[PDB]
Amino acid sequence: RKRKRGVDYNAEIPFEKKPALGFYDTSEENYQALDADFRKLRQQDLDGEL
Amino acid sequence: VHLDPAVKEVQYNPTYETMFAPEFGPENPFRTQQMAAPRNMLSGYAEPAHINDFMFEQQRRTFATYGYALDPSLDN
Amino acid sequence: SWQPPNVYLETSMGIIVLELYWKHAPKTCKNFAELARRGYYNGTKFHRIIKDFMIQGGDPTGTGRGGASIYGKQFEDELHPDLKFTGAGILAMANAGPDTNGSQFFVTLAPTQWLDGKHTIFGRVCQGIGMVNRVGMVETNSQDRPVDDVKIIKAYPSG
Amino acid sequence: AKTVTKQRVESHFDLELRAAVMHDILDMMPEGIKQNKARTILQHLSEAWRCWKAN
Amino acid sequence: WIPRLLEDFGDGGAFPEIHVAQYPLDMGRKKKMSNALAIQVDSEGKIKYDAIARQGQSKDKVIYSKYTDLVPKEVMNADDPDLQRPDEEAIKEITEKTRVALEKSVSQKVAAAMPVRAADKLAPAQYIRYTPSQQGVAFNSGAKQRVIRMVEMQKDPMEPPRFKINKKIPRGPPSPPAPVMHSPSRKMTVKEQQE
Amino acid sequence: NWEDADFPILCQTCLGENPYIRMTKEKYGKECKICARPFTVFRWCPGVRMRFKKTEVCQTCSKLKNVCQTCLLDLEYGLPIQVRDAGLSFKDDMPKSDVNKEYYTQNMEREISNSDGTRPVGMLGKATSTSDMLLKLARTTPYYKRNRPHICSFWVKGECKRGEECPYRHEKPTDPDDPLADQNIKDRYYGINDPVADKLLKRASTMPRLDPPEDKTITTLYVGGLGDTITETDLRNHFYQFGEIRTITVVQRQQCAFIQFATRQAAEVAAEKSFNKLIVNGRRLNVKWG
Amino acid sequence: TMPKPQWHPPWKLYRVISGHLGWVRCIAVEPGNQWFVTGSADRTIKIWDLASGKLKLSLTGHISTVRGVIVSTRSPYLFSCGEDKQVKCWDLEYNKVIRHYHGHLSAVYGLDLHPTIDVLVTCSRDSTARIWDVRTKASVHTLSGHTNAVATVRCQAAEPQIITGSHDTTIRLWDLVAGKTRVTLTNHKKSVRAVVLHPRHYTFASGSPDNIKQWKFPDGSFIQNLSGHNAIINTLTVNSDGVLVSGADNGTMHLWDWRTGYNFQRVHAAVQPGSLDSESGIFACAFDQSESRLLTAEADKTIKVYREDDTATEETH
Amino acid sequence: SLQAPIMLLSGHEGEVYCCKFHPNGSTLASAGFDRLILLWNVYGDCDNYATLKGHSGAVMELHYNTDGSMLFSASTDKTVAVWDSETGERVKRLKGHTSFVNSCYPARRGPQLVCTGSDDGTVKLWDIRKKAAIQTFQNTYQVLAVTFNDTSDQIISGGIDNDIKVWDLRQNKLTYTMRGHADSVTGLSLSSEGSYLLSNAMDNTVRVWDVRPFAPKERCVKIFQGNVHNFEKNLLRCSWSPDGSKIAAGSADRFVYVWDTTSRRILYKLPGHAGSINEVAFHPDEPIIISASSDKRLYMGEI
Ligand SMILES: [Zn+2]
Ligand SMILES: [Zn+2]
Ligand SMILES: [Zn+2]
To answer: Binding site membership of C for cyclosporin A: which residues?
Structure first.
């Protein structure tokens, strides 16, 4: 791969701004990721019906 | 007992009792060796000296030649 | 040579009432009660406020090095073998070293071992721990100095 | 910062007129208007100038 | 004479004689690592909700965040000493500080316009006293300070610029948004919205 | 932007064993090994048989991560950054990909140059909470084998024609079949797969440490090395910190003191505070379970 | 009736100067009341005799519309700016351009001279102000932080030395030494296209289509709010007798008290003969140094000159 | 009082070894390594009016007469310069020493006499009219500080032999030896009465010695501590207040030391010098202090 930018997208968060924090503790809670299911999944299935 | 603990650059002449009285209370335990030291930029206090060139380089070569020199610290 | 009960502070944030122990240390109690009586604290501030440690107060210069007493600038401590620094509210006497006490108190916020290792327990607060907590939640800076003024307005040697 | 020399003059005039109209329609609309519709008014300005040249 | 709870504490104040670990409100020993910026209160006013407005600002910055900044002041009767331009000599002092501060930046800009005319000279070899803040001595050799002689490295006249400067990156975030302080907002009708 | 600040931010094992230093200042000499923007390079000689060390990173890239500009170790402890972030949290997440790195560097440079110029801008609040295992393997006295001239590569081919005059060492380089040999600059700086820090963490994990209360609700503490010179009146004065203290059985014949607390949480907290740290009356007090 | 305002006499037109071939976008008066400048959309700066209303000189050289013109009080100079992106300095001794100030990216909308340092401060459509050294033609600072075009600028010698309103509805009070913002005043709902400084009382006002607001200088405290003149206002100017003038794009112009903010006169002037009813509009106004004439620069390519009515009180609310 | 307290004075170019207040107290002379003598105002705006050249060495010691007429400079090119207080001319240059002249002092109220000490071991007496040395006292060692009594009958001399020596002019013999300093004496000052004499020494003890016809024979009157001497080996000078009530001494830890003469208590420990201090001096009328240090600058503390 020969390019300056472009590999910066999957490697990390592109021009990352952390959310400004305050008055409520937001360190314990976290989100549950997406179920892969790589035996039914289609490129059409992620983007949805146009 | 009369002046601010740290502002800097006093416009009048203070006394020895009005500048070098100790700070009261207990020291806070919420600071480290670096955070409790009187530092100026992240690793200590750096101030311009005006030592004579010959005496400076004398003690420098004295340490570099044998292994000892006089102390340039100003109180210690 | 009399022994009043609780001392009435009237700060900017509210009214703290101080229950001062006359058995364990009567000499600091007579000093502090006399200074509250004369009008020494009317207009002085809580110069040093640390989060969850204590609130140091009482300085006509408002610096943390000034102050004097009725005895004159110093007197010995009352390091009692019963009084121990545990929990918020405990009123105390500020120090400079061994047995040097001026006119600076501090209400403690947290259980501390080094304090009753080397400090004098004056007394405690009885009425007003919420105002103590609101004073503890005030913005500070590098050397633990408030940006605004957290000053005491009046003081009464009641009881 | 490129200078407006001789081959940029008409393009820069039309670049600045359009910005002036943008400012005036942002300030002319009252308080609760949907703040779209700048492009359409600029198209009408273009059409009014072509009808001016066309008499 | 029984602690045991936060109830027996009437209006608080832990007794310093019980020799237990009582504490009036909940000043817990293991107050967990909370990233919540602490709720701070002003002298006799409200909870400072200003702290979520001045995130990236400093403590001297004057931002406006309350309703009491939108209230009109009085007519301020006459030639009042409240609304007065500071002082003529104070203005001259501000002018002097400002012109001396500006001329230095001017000289640093203009130095490019003639980079080499009488090409430069550099030997103010200076001294600085430095306190390591590391003491515990095995470090200097046993000392508390150290003196350093700084000479500035002598620049080659015949040497081109060293590094690529043309590298180009997008604009960073602007300083934290100011509260907008508008009026209540005039109500809009269907008729005028359509017209 | 350029860096241009006077007098670098240095430790004591690189600043030398002489209190009298002559250093040179080059205004925009090198580019940073991390930031890749040019900074002010300071060049000094620590001692007599040293190497003329110089600063490798910006003032800014040392203010981000509280390190020395040439050994890239913590100013306070003298340890790699992976060890210190292991004994802390890791919430910085400095970007490594190109445009993100220069963008983050620009924004943090504006952040630092919109502030005082004294504190480790993000590491400060987490730098309050400290004294983990890193203090029990912090280096006590300076390792002056760092400031030491590299292996003479002409002496490796047995062709060093300078001989006795060459200022480079005539001694063995390390076998490259070693994990302790690769060591990139950015690997040492971001705290990622640093083998020195790996070995320090492997040592600090096998450091002697607390065991849990194997049986339920037992708060009993088995104190060996109690000593016959100390008093039990001072024991309660050290021990009322934790909570509702229960009975304290004392056996001064085996130098073993038995301790009971109210909850097992208080006994675990006491195990945390006490084990292999606590020295009272200048004499080590050993506490165990069972 | 909370205040009682000062009585100000009504103003009336007495002279309509004509001769520009474009909208007259700026105007300024010389320090000695001998003449006044106008700058216009026909790319000429015209020097007019103030007493007689006669065209003294016509200077050319801008490639696009002249947006601001100011006369230096310390140096014998004339500064101008245009939609040309250009900022010029005219030596009035020679009637020739001697210096151009280069670096703005788009059209320069305004300029003000610092009264004591020889510093020129300009605004542009590129959302920045700039700070120029007059003698070395160099950008000292680039006051950036607005998000839309920047409409106007005023300078002082006292604190905040630079004050600007812009088309992103905000006002920024700046530091000339550091080059960073000190106060942001967001009170206006539409674009601040005029700010004006008071000669004595250490306050300033600013105008926008919603309403006009007065303000104390150190930290922008709200003092008052002057409303009733609801159009896109282009300029504000103050008489030392406390007369605020607010002129707008519809050609209307309202005369106000500074202290109480009482609207005592509305002047909705008539257009030039050839002109169009939609072409009524004011872009600039100035008081003379005697503060008894009112020079307005109109969208019907004219200058109008007003003076106080000598027929006393017919007035008082 | 004059102007605003501080009045920092710059213009010097190297170290500033010495400084003296005018006998009326309206002007000032400063000198040091600069091979220059500067005459500045004490009042108004404290601005330079006279620069005095005429040396090929470092101007070690500076003094005045009691009139404010004759300016005496001891330089490090084995000569002493004699000038007029106004008009700035080289009036009398006197060359007799074979090594560096460390200090000079004029005998006051008597006929015009100057006594100097040098590194060759010599303490020499000088009449300004004679172009020749009057009396020469080989001690044996380097001599750093030299002053008279009020009677113009004794030479009080400090050297590196840890012993203050008092010479009689009539007997030409070693009259007094004063023991009590553990290291070299760098500066002597005789009081306004002549009763007491103040001494700095390298052992970091500032000593007061009573010079009287009748002695307690162990003249260890007052001892001051806090004064720091270091590797720089500077010649440190001390000074008396006009009423003898305050005592100033230069220090090598950049703190201006002023003691109270009766309680032996540190009155003032004024900061504000980057470099080590060489001489601190009191204004003769008013409590104003000129302090001179190696950071090339002068300070006017107003008490
Ligand atoms: Zn860097
Ligand atoms: Zn290092
Ligand atoms: Zn070799």
So the answer is: 47-58, 63-64, 92-97, 102-106, 112, 118
Q: Where along chain F do its domains lie? A: 1-148+185-207, 149-184, 208-290
Asked if the C-beta of F240 comes within 8 angstroms of chain C's C-beta atoms, the answer is: yes
Gap between the Cα atoms of C14 and G273, Å rounded: 73
**Residues in CB range of E170: below 8 A, 6 or more apart:** A15, F103
- CA B69 vs. chain centroid, Å, equals 20
C-beta atoms of G184 and E63 within 8 A: yes
Catalytic residues of C: 48, 53, 56, 95, 106, 115, 119
Selected for mutation to probe chain E from G101, G127, G133 (highest E CB count within 10 Å) is G133
Of F31, F102, F110, the CB nearest to E169: F102
Taking CA atoms, F177 is separated from F146, F155, F199, in Å, by: 21, 21, 16
Asked if residue C83 lies in contact with residue E16, where contact means CB atoms within 8 angstroms, the answer is: yes
Phi, psi of H117 (to 5 degrees): -130, 145
Nearest to B60 among F9, F18, F130 (CB): F18
Q: What is the DSSP letter of F32?
A: -
Distances (CA, A) of E131 to F9, F53, H281: 12, 20, 31
Domain C1-159 in CATH 2.40.100.10? yes
CB-CB neighbors (< 8 A) of G103 in chain D: 1
Joined tokens for residue E139: 């470090």
Question: Do E18 and C83 form a contact (C-beta atoms < 8 A)?
Answer: no
Buried b (16+ CB within 10 A) or exposed e, C75-111: bebbebeebbbbbbbbbbbbbbeeeebbbbbbbbbbb
Q: B40 alpha carbon to ligand 2 midpoint, in Å?
A: 18
Task: For residue F113, give how far its alpha carbon lies from the nearest alpha carbon of chain E (Å).
Answer: 12
Full DSSP string of H131-169: SSEEEEEE-SS-EEEEEE-TTS-EEEEEESSSEEEEEET
What is the chain D residue with the closest CA to E188?
D32
The helix or strand, by DSSP H or E, that contains position F197, with its residue range, turns out to be helix F195-205
CA of F51 to the centre of ligand 3 (A): 14
G45, G297 contact by CB (below 8 A): no
Nearest to B59 among H5, H231, H303 (CB): H231
Q: How far is the CA of F165 from the centre of ligand 3 (A)?
A: 7
Please name the method used to determine this structure. Answer: cryo-EM
Q: Do E and G count as touching (3 or more CB pairs closer than 8 A)? A: yes
**Cα angle G101-G295-G285, degrees, rounded to a multiple of 5:** 55
Domain boundary assignment for chain C: 1-159
Measured CA to CA, the distance from residue H268 to residue H280 in angstroms comes to 12
- Exposed/middle/buried for residue B72 (C-beta within 10 Å: 0-12, 13-18, 19+): buried
Q: How would CATH label the architecture of H1-303? A: 7 Propeller (2.130)
Q: How far apart are CA G268 and CA G277, in angstroms?
A: 12
CA angle F32, F36, F42 (to 5 degrees): 20
Q: Say if residues C157 and C7 touch (Cβ distance below 8 Å).
A: yes
Q: How far is the CA of F149 from the centre of ligand 3 (A)?
A: 10
* D4 vs E150: CA distance, rounded Å: 50
User: Looking at the DSSP assignment, which residues form a beta bridge with residue H266?
Assistant: H259
Helix (H) or strand (E) holding C133: helix C129-136
Please report, as a single letter, which amino acid is at residue C121.
I
The residue extents of the domains of chain H are: 1-303
Structural contact between residues C49 and C138, judged by C-beta atoms closer than 8 angstroms: yes
